[PDB]
Point group: C5
Chain length 25, copies 5
């Protein structure tokens, strides 16, 4: 099922975006 994969990849994207925000400030 690709739905669970999509949600997992979105979660990774959110985590990395938060990492980028932390890096900027």
């Amino acid at each position: 099922d690709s739905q669970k994969w999509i949600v997992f990849l979105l979660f990774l994207i959110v985590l990395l975006q938060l990492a980028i925000v932390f890096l900027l400030r």
Copy 2:
């Protein structure tokens, strides 16, 4: 279901992207 999680994570992504933009500016 999965759609709720996908929309919620997209909301989080947009908020983080706004944070990134506001930090750049």
Copy 3:
């Protein structure tokens, strides 16, 4: 429909990424 929310949020992300590209120049 959740598809409308997904498309709209991706549109917002596209705008925000365009803004990031503009601010990085």
Copy 4:
């Protein structure tokens, strides 16, 4: 359908993000 726009947006994001990478290094 609306799905065709999702992909259309998603790849766009990818392209912009690639530009972002080159805009940092």
Copy 5:
């Protein structure tokens, strides 16, 4: 299917974000 395209593009976005995080460090 096109969900496979979605997953593939999400993985590319994750790789690009990881490249961003590694470049910034």
